[PDB]
Structures are given as structure tokens and as C-alpha cells.
Amino acid sequence: THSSPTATAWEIGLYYELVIPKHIYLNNWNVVNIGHLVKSAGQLTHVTI
């Protein structure tokens, strides 16, 4: 906004985005599906939920 050899001035526009939480969850586990093998009419088959 101003530029002398002994003086300066600047302006900065900052925009912020604050997420407001509804609930916070701390003690958490990841799921790992393993399933089960089934041997049916000769064929081996992997079964999963």
C-alpha cells in the first residue's frame, strides 16, 4: 500500500474455514474380513459376510 526507501506498508486477506464437531471418537479399531473355506461337490470355495 506504500513504498518509500525508509517506509513500507502491506495488507493481507486471509480466509479461514473452521469445522465445528458434532461428535469425536477416540478408541477405534479397523475391520479385517477373513471368511471361511467350504468344499462342495468337488469345488473349494471361499465364503465371506
Binding site: 471361511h36 467350504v38 462342495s40 465364503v47
Partner: peptide, 17 residues
């Protein structure tokens, strides 16, 4: 149309000695 197998993830049930 026959009834098929049942699975219940019980290891103790499938023990072979």
C-alpha cells in the same frame, strides 16, 4: 433341494487327534 452345510467359526468342534 437338499439342506446344505452349516458354519459357526468354532475351532474346538473341528479338532483332530
Amino acid at each position: 433341494q437338499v439342506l446344505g452345510p452349516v458354519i459357526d467359526w468354532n475351532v474346538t468342534q473341528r479338532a483332530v487327534y
